Structure 1
């Protein structure tokens, strides 16, 4: 009986995570009329 073992050794690794996402407006508003009429 034989296997393929790997010698585990202490390594120096940095811990960083990537969070995917979409950009979005900080704030949004709509422009609307509140009286009837013609746009001058």
Structure 2
């Protein structure tokens, strides 16, 4: 008889490790916008009258 077979309880289990090292990093953002001309001039009449040409 018997059939116990006590396994070794103490294992101290293996652990996946990653050593951290200092490394510089830049920070940048994407932002939405529109485009605009350097100068826009809407031509408006400074007198009165009919457009002839």
Shorter-chain TM-score bucket reads 0.3 to 0.5
Gaps of 5+ in 2: 1-12
* CA RMSD across the alignment: 3.6
Cα shift at 1:39: 0.3
Of the structure 1 ranges 30-39 and 8-17, higher mean CA displacement relative to structure 2 is found in 8-17
Q: What TM-score comes out, normalization by structure 2 length?
A: 0.37
Structure (1 or 2) with the larger CA radius of gyration = 2
Of the structure 1 ranges 14-23 and 25-34, higher mean CA displacement relative to structure 2 is found in 14-23
Cα shift at 1:7: 3.8
Gaps of 5+ in 1: none
Q: What TM-score comes out, normalization by structure 1 length?
A: 0.44
Q: Distance in 2 between matches of 1:5 and 1:21?
A: 44
Question: How many residues matched?
Answer: 40
